Amino acid sequence: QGTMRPLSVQGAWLSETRAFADDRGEFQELYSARSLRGALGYDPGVAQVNRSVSRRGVLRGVHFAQLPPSQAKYVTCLSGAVLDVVVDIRTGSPTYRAWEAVRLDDPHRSLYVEAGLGHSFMALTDDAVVVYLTSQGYAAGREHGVHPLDPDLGIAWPDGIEPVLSEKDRQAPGIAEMERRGLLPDYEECLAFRRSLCERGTG
Amino acid sequence: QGTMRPLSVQGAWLSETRAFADDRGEFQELYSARSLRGALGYDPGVAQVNRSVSRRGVLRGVHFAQLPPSQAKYVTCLSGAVLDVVVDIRTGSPTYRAWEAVRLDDPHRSLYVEAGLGHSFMALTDDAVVVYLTSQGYAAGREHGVHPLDPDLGIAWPDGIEPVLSEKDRQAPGIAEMERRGLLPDYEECLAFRRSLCERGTG
Ligand SMILES: Cc1cn([C@H]2C[C@H](O)[C@@H](COP(=O)(O)OP(=O)(O)O)O2)c(=O)[nH]c1=O
Ligand SMILES: Cc1cn([C@H]2C[C@H](O)[C@@H](COP(=O)(O)OP(=O)(O)O)O2)c(=O)[nH]c1=O
Ligand SMILES: [Cl-]
Ligand SMILES: [Cl-]
């Protein structure tokens, strides 16, 4: 049926889901916990499903919950198109500060971002709708951000679209400032958290 | 924030979810497990997220998974409009064969249908998109159906829209035939299953 395959940043995955089309329309399995368990070694669970509507050029991120337990995300653009960027915010990672852009322009493609990574996207179309599943409920005191236009990340956001940032995102610190202030996830700690999820039922 | 309140059929609920609107668009908490736990006494979990696109007049249902563990559903029309009908297929229920129609015409309204109830909807607009969370993964051998146009249910589907049924739904038996063949959930068994979910962690 559908595939799930690792991206260039360890802990980020691309899901391609299958639809069964017929005269009535279509039926799609957008998310399968069984499927994630086979690929990841654990079922991340779904504490919250969030939906955002974004005007064109709106850039949300780079956001992450404090580890642990942080928040894993399964992200899908249900209509319109976004450019999703995953950011390796994890100090000590062999790919720390690296990023990868995935075009999410079809409901049949989903991005999984494990706990401890940074997530962001820009709306490529007016009223782009994004729906994401999170492993952990929202907690304002636990949510953090790095500035998406930080030259230290140097994310290639689309030429020809002016970013529209929230007040919060506009004021966000750069990666270096988050790092020195010890506010970024530690890579070793991320990997240990990953192993811990596999071990809830390794007995 | 958002409300969750019982409908007229015990085990069906209406969720009204809140969005935070701003210049960038909006952010909605479409589903909260914490919220369901407060109302229901248990977190149903999310094994699968399904998405269907339906042409106008398409009627999917009345469907249910064999109890147990059957399948609880959290259903939302993300765009366009459907008329959702919940059916009490549970023999011995004080409201057996009763139904209730909910207009799902806004992404901020969701319907929860606990394990053991029947679910169906008709597309009121062309390409109505429905997204639903299920507590249990899909299993073809476990999925059953009652004919949605059964006069023994007498569901008031919208006047002026011709139903479009799949081959499977077109051929589905009536409620009476499912009943005598012992293929419907038992009400007592439904209630016991409900109590069992509360008790996974009543220790
Ligand atoms: C992330 C999140 C935000 N919110 C609220 C807080 C704000 O009032 C509004 C937007 O928050 P914000 O953090 O700016 O969201 P985004 O990730 O889309 O940039 O939504 C929730 O209610 N729940 C959540 O899980
Ligand atoms: C309910 C369901 C159906 N399917 C498949 C079986 C069929 O080929 C197709 C449509 O099934 P069908 O049972 O007719 O779906 P609906 O509830 O929308 O009437 O989708 C899945 O792959 N997973 C599921 O969870
Ligand atoms: Cl998830
Ligand atoms: Cl559910």
Side-chain angles (χ1 to χ4, degrees):
Chain A
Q1 192 187 357
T3 58
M4 198 173 153
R5 291 183 184 142
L7 296 172
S8 75
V9 172
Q10 190 188 102
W13 296 69
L14 187 59
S15 185
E16 303 214 279
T17 57
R18 252 83 192 177
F20 312 73
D22 69 18
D23 68 300
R24 291 180 310 164
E26 84 172 63
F27 183 98
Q28 171 201 2
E29 296 202 0
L30 185 139
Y31 168 90
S32 161
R34 209 188 93 170
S35 175
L36 264 63
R37 203 164 27 239
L40 301 180
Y42 62 90
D43 171 358
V46 174
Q48 207 167 304
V49 177
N50 295 332
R51 178 177 161 271
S52 71
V53 185
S54 309
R55 303 314 298 289
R56 186 172 182 267
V58 165
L59 202 178
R60 301 182 188 255
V62 175
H63 300 155
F64 69 95
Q66 204 137 36
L67 182 99
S70 177
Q71 259 182 349
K73 300 165 190 165
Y74 186 90
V75 181
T76 312
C77 182
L78 280 205
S79 68
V82 305
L83 183 76
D84 199 284
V85 178
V86 177
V87 181
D88 194 345
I89 49 175
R90 298 167 307 192
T91 53
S93 164
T95 57
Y96 172 55
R97 283 180 189 201
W99 52 270
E100 177 162 7
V102 186
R103 193 181 212 85
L104 288 186
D105 63 24
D106 185 293
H108 302 94
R109 183 193 289 190
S110 297
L111 165 88
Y112 178 80
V113 188
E114 80 168 351
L117 282 166
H119 175 243
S120 70
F121 68 78
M122 174 177 291
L124 300 177
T125 63
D126 217 28
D127 300 337
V129 174
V130 175
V131 167
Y132 64 95
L133 322 191
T134 57
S135 67
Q136 287 296 331
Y138 174 58
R142 313 289 291 185
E143 197 98 344
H144 297 284
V146 174
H147 198 286
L149 305 184
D150 182 347
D152 281 334
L153 297 175
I155 300 166
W157 294 109
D159 304 282
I161 306 170
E162 201 40 22
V164 182
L165 301 171
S166 66
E167 183 41 37
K168 183 162 57 46
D169 293 340
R170 213 169 267 283
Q171 290 294 323
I175 187 91
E177 169 174 350
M178 283 297 268
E179 175 203 323
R180 68 171 187 258
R181 284 267 155 182
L183 283 157
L184 293 180
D186 170 276
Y187 183 64
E188 266 320 292
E189 292 205 343
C190 287
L191 293 180
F193 190 73
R194 187 197 297 164
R195 284 184 309 256
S196 296
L197 300 176
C198 295
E199 286 179 293
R200 311 187 88 178
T202 212
Chain B
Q1 192 187 357
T3 58
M4 198 173 153
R5 291 183 184 142
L7 296 172
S8 75
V9 172
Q10 190 188 102
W13 296 69
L14 187 59
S15 185
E16 303 214 279
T17 57
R18 252 83 192 177
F20 312 73
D22 69 18
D23 68 300
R24 291 180 310 164
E26 84 172 63
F27 183 98
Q28 171 201 2
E29 296 202 0
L30 185 139
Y31 168 90
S32 161
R34 209 188 93 170
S35 175
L36 264 63
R37 203 164 27 239
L40 301 180
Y42 62 90
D43 171 358
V46 174
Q48 207 167 304
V49 177
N50 295 332
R51 178 177 161 271
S52 71
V53 185
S54 309
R55 303 314 298 289
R56 186 172 182 267
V58 165
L59 202 178
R60 301 182 188 255
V62 175
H63 300 155
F64 69 95
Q66 204 137 36
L67 182 99
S70 177
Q71 259 182 349
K73 300 165 190 165
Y74 186 90
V75 181
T76 312
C77 182
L78 280 205
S79 68
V82 305
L83 183 76
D84 199 284
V85 178
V86 177
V87 181
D88 194 345
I89 49 175
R90 298 167 307 192
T91 53
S93 164
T95 57
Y96 172 55
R97 283 180 189 201
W99 52 270
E100 177 162 7
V102 186
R103 193 181 212 85
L104 288 186
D105 63 24
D106 185 293
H108 302 94
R109 183 193 289 190
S110 297
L111 165 88
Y112 178 80
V113 188
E114 80 168 351
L117 282 166
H119 175 243
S120 70
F121 68 78
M122 174 177 291
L124 300 177
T125 63
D126 217 28
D127 300 337
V129 174
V130 175
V131 167
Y132 64 95
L133 322 191
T134 57
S135 67
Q136 287 296 331
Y138 174 58
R142 313 289 291 185
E143 197 98 344
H144 297 284
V146 174
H147 198 286
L149 305 184
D150 182 347
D152 281 334
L153 297 175
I155 300 166
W157 294 109
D159 304 282
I161 306 170
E162 201 40 22
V164 182
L165 301 171
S166 66
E167 183 41 37
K168 183 162 57 46
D169 293 340
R170 213 169 267 283
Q171 290 294 323
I175 187 91
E177 169 174 350
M178 283 297 268
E179 175 203 323
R180 68 171 187 258
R181 284 267 155 182
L183 283 157
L184 293 180
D186 170 276
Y187 183 64
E188 266 320 292
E189 292 205 343
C190 287
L191 293 180
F193 190 73
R194 187 197 297 164
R195 284 184 309 256
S196 296
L197 300 176
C198 295
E199 286 179 293
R200 311 187 88 178
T202 212

